[PDB]
Amino acid sequence: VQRIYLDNNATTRIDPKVKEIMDPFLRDHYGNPSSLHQFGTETHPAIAEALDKLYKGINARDIDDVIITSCATESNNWVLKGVYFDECLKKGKNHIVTTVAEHPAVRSTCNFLESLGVEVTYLPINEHGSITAEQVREAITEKTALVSVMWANNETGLIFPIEEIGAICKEKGVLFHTDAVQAIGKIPVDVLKANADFLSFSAHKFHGPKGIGGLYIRSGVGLTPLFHGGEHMNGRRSGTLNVPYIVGMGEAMKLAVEHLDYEKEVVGKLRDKLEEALLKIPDVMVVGDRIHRVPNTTLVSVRGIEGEAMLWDLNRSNIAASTGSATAIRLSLSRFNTEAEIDKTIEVFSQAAVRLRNI
Amino acid sequence: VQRIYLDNNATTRIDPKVKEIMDPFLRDHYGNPSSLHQFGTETHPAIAEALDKLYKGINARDIDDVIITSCATESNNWVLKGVYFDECLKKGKNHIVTTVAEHPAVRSTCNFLESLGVEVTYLPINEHGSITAEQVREAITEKTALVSVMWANNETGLIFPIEEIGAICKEKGVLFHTDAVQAIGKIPVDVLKANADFLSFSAHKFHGPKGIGGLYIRSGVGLTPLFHGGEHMNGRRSGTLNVPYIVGMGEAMKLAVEHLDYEKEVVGKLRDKLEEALLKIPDVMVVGDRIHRVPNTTLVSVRGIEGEAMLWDLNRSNIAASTGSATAIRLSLSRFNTEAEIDKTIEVFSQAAVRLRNI
Numbered sequence: 137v138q139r140i141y142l143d144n145n146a147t148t149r150i151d152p153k154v155k156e157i158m159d160p161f162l163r164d165h166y167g168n169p170s171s172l173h174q175f176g177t178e179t180h181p182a183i184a185e186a187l188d189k190l191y192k193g194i195n196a197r198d199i200d201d202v203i204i205t206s207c208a209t210e211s212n213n214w215v216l217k218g219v220y221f222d223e224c225l226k227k228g229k230n231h232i233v234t235t236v237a238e239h240p241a242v243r244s245t246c247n248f249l250e251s252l253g254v255e256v257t258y259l260p261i262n263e264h265g266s267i268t269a270e271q272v273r274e275a276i277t278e279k280t281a282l283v284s285v286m287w288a289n290n291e292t293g294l295i296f297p298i299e300e301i302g303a304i305c306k307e308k309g310v311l312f313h314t315d316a317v318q319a320i321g322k323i324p325v326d327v328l329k330a331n332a333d334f335l336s337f338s339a340h341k342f343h344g345p346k347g348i349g350g351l352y353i354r355s356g357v358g359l360t361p362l363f364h365g366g367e368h369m370n371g372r373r374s375g376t377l378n379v380p381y382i383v384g385m386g387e388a389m390k391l392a393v394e395h396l397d398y399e400k401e402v403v404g405k406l407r408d409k410l411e412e413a414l415l416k417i418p419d420v421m422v423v424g425d426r427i428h429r430v431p432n433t434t435l436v437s438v439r440g441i442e443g444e445a446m447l448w449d450l451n452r453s454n455i456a457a458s459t460g461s462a463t464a465i466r467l468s469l470s471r472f473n474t475e476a477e478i479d480k481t482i483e484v485f486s487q488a489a490v491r492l493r494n495i
Numbered sequence: 496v497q498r499i500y501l502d503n504n505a506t507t508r509i510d511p512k513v514k515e516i517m518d519p520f521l522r523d524h525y526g527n528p529s530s531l532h533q534f535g536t537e538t539h540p541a542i543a544e545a546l547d548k549l550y551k552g553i554n555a556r557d558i559d560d561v562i563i564t565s566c567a568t569e570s571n572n573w574v575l576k577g578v579y580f581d582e583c584l585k586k587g588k589n590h591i592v593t594t595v596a597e598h599p600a601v602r603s604t605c606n607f608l609e610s611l612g613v614e615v616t617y618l619p620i621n622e623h624g625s626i627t628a629e630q631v632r633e634a635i636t637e638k639t640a641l642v643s644v645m646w647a648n649n650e651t652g653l654i655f656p657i658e659e660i661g662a663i664c665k666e667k668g669v670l671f672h673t674d675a676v677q678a679i680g681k682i683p684v685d686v687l688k689a690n691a692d693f694l695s696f697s698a699h700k701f702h703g704p705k706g707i708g709g710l711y712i713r714s715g716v717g718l719t720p721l722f723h724g725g726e727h728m729n730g731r732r733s734g735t736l737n738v739p740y741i742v743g744m745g746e747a748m749k750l751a752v753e754h755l756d757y758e759k760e761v762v763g764k765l766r767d768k769l770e771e772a773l774l775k776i777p778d779v780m781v782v783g784d785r786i787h788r789v790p791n792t793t794l795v796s797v798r799g800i801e802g803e804a805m806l807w808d809l810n811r812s813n814i815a816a817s818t819g820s821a822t823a824i825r826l827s828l829s830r831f832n833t834e835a836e837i838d839k840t841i842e843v844f845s846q847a848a849v850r851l852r853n854i
């Protein structure tokens with residue numbers, strides 16, 4: 137069989153080059169980076185080069201941190217629970233501003249915070265699919281400790297106006313976190329433009345392994361550790377480093393960035409091909425704005441069918457994809473897809489479409 | 496060159512079989528276990544078999560949890576910070592009992608807890624190297640929320656009387672966590688014998704990859720998540736699973752347990768060989784008790800030399816090891832060592848010994 141993968145916002149294949157680069161750290165460079173002897177020191181250089189790659193991915197300066205984590209969910213829980221202790225409790229700054237769009241790691245953590253007594257406002261989503269900036273402007277109180285808005289949306293592919301949000305946040309004196317998980321490798325990411333104080337990502341959205349990610353922390357911004365024990369990552373996050381996955385994720389980030397133009401021109405073109413082909417069906421509205429999306433995503437709906445039903449049929453034709461908020465169907469490409477696979481999807485989708493209608 | 500690795504309590508080589516089993520999950524079974532389509536469902540079976548292996552390693556029942564984490568430091572921070580919220584805050588049970596022996600993840604987290612207002616008593620270590628049980632008996636107040644004692648000590652290899660501690664904890668109504676990181680693969684581990692409510696481990700102490708670990712949670716014991724977001728691990732710890740490392744760590748645990756007798760009879764014998772050979776030097780006292788140690792560790796001191804100096808010289812002779820509390824030298828074997836390598840160490844150590852004395 138010839139299977140087609142269109143669920144890249146759920147996770148992604150590890151790049152062959154990523155696999156190849158981690159391999160010697162599963163084989164004989166197994167030493168613990170903290171060890172003082174050769175087994176440890178010999179991992180130094182590769183670690184350093186990984187970190188360089190991460191820095192250059194997100195336009196982070198020497199004086200900033202990019203801390204390695206076990207995934208974006210760790211990152212996001214760290215940021216929220218750290219600012220709770222540093223701001224909400226110790227500074228009485230008892231309010232967080234976020235959106236209804238956010239990943240559940242963010243939203244569940246916020247919920248928990250409310251349980252303890254933080255007030256969290258959850259910004260509503262507009263007709264244009266997006267949040268405005270002015271919406272955050274108008275929410276930022278005296279008490280506001282942090283604003284958290286995701287860079288791009290995992291369900292619709294919509295880019296939020298981070299940066300404008302950056303500015304509104306600078307002007308008003310407030311901590312700014314952006315969850316940038318679905319922006320890496322998909323559009324350029326620049327914490328400087330963004331005035332991020334905090335930024336999250338996870339390798340497996342850009343062809344590294346599941347099980348690692350980063351939190352960008354800006355210079356001189358405190359954030360009480362989520363993993364105390366304090367020896368690794370300048371005491372910001374304790375635990376023996378995941379050497380192999382570090383090295384992998386370096387590589388991934390690099391390749392991700394190198395492919396920005398390819399993502400834009402080629403993958404985006406593929407997405408468009410697909411999109412147009414599918415709008416030719418009947419009442420197949422696309423979902424949300426079409427102009428401010430990451431290149432690789434399209435969330436279509438289909439008049440009289442469930443998303444789940446569509447998905448299940450697609451699966452039997454060896455095509456993988458997932459749902460989103462109405463349900464609707466999310467098709468999420470990557471550089472690994474080809475025009476052949478799109479064409480095929482167009483066929484198998486339309487057949488499936490026609491074939492499920494009468495029920 | 497022929498290098499000799501004796502720093503197994505710092506980390507360990509991934510077993511070839513562990514490497515081999517994770518490999519297809521870095522290659523083409525890259526789907527996200529949550530996905531509903533084949534790419535996801537096809538990871539189901541291997542995940543399940545991994546989990547089975549983990550269960551059987553630690554004598555955990557079906558109705559218990561073994562939750563996958565990013566490492567033992569995650570585990571330990573989870574346990575302490577969860578019981579703070581479930582017990583210290585919500586039940587007014589404002590005291591934790593632990594030892595001075597514990598890993599810094601435990602101790603730093605405790606320190607942080609104190610910062611917020613928990614009272615933590617830190618049980619002092621005795622002349623016999625160990626903690627008694629009666630010592631915990633006598634500390635358990637009305638207010639005591641949790642007792643945390645490590646199963647074996649990473650610095651000395653000393654086994655604490657967990658189980659007796661289990662009983663004293665059952666009788667008095669108190670939550671029992673044991674950090675068992677250095678017991679996996681080294682002596683049998685049995686949460687049932689132990690009345691653990693919580694038990695930690697990390698794969699890289701038993702020849703799986705760094706960057707994953709477990710928290711055993713006993714049936715019906717709550718523990719407010721450290722990673723909110725709640726979709727993975729029955730909502731106890733959110734984040735896309737580390738499929739490859741799961742599968743690896745399964746395998747590791749299995750092999751670890753299969754090798755218990757080999758660890759006892761062969762590795763322990765090797766350790767003894769080494770130990771005796773080195774006691775023949777001059778005022779080379781061994782450090783702590785010699786009778787209740789995991790098979791693989793020995794912490795020697797050397798009359799007139801620093802530990803660091805000894806280590807550095809050893810490193811130049813291609814032998815890897817680390818220090819411990821007075822400083823002293825820790826030599827930590829695994830099944831991968833051979834009598835040849837010991838012999839060699841005996842030589843290179845004694846030469847180094849004699850050669851560093853006059854200064």
Ligand SMILES: Cc1ncc(COP(=O)(O)O)c(CN[C@@H](C)C(=O)O)c1O
Nearest residue numbers: 145146207208209239290317338734735
């Ligand atoms: C924007 C965003 N933030 C955070 C996460 C969580 O990353 P980890 O699971 O690596 O912590 C994801 C992945 N989500 C999946 C569940 C999806 O979109 O289908 C995401 O898309």
Ligand SMILES: Cc1ncc(COP(=O)(O)O)c(CN[C@@H](C)C(=O)O)c1O
Nearest residue numbers: 375376504505566567568598649676697
């Ligand atoms: C008893 C114990 N608990 C917890 C940990 C932390 O595990 P992770 O780093 O996998 O979270 C270790 C490893 N320690 C090293 C630093 C040593 O003994 O030399 C340990 O020995």
Ligand SMILES: [Cl-]
Nearest residue numbers: 217360361362
């Ligand atoms: Cl915290």
Ligand SMILES: [Cl-]
Nearest residue numbers: 576719720721
């Ligand atoms: Cl928590």
